[PDB]
Amino acid sequence: MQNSVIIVDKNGRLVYLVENPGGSVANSKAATVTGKLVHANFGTKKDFEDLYTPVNGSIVIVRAGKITFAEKVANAESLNAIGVLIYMDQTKFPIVNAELSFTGKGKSGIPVQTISRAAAEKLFGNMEGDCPSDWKTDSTCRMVTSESKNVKLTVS
Ligand code: NA
Numbered sequence: 303m304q305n306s307v308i309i310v311d312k313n314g315r316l317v318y319l320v321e322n323p324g325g326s327v328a329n330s331k332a333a334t335v336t337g338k339l340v341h342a343n344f345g346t347k348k349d350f351e352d353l354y355t356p357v358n359g360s361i362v363i364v365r366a367g368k369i370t371f372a373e374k375v376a377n378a379e380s381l382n383a384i385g386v387l388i389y390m391d392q393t394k395f396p397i398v399n400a401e402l403s404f405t406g407k408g409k410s411g412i413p414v415q416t417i418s419r420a421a422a423e424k425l426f427g428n429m430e431g432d433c434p435s436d437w438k439t440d441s442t443c444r445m446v447t448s449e450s451k452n453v454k455l456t457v458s
Contacts, residue, residue, distance in 0.1 A: 304354070306346035307387060308454040309428055309447075310336060318428065322423035327388075329402040330414040331381055332458040335384040337361050338427050339425060339453040341445045343437050344353055345374030350381060352434060355446045363425065365439075366390045367398065373413050376406035385455040386414045386445065389422035413457035425453070 303322035310398050314336060337371050338360040343349035344362035350357065362378040382423060390397060397416040423442050431445030447453060 304456050305316070305415060305458065306454075306456050307347065307415065307425070308456075309425070310452055311456045312452070317456055320424045320453075321417050322394070323415060323417050323421070324379065325396055325398065325400055325416055326458060327400040327402060327414040327416055330410055331412060333385070333413040334363040334454070334456045335340075335361065335413060335455045336452050337384050339363055339387070339429060339447045341429070341433060341443065342374075342378065343427075343433075343439070344368040345377050347377055347383060350377055351439075355431075357383050359384060361387065363387040365422075370403050370405070371400060371414070372402040372405045372410070375402065375410050375412065379410070379429055380406065380413050383412060385412050385457075386417045386456065387422070387425075387453075388414070389419055389429070391419060391422075394419050412452065413455055415455060415457050 316378035433443035
């Protein structure tokens, strides 16, 4: 299956298959990107200001809420992110029929994929850094992938 999120080594070879998500983000660009994965909470501008790790060239994972998916992606894109992962912490069930409205430049320049909660926790288990307490996130939450690992996103 193409639509997939994979944890790869520095050669791009699979180390863990995180998910082959069933749903597909409407209006997302088709691309295969690889980079460090960075948690940006809800993807609001304040959350990105809260980051200590550079967004430039990384894949961003945000949870649903507060703002539209498009606003999250636009915030990540503005900071030179290469891709976005969206999940829901409140339930195990997937985001159904994800769609992007229009903000900023009016089109999503970077690939966007929704993933299940179990997939996100799979990613957090392979990431480093405890999430800020003000985020009120689950204890599983983690901020960044370590040096040893990178995430590969393949969309549509
Ligand atoms: Na950070």
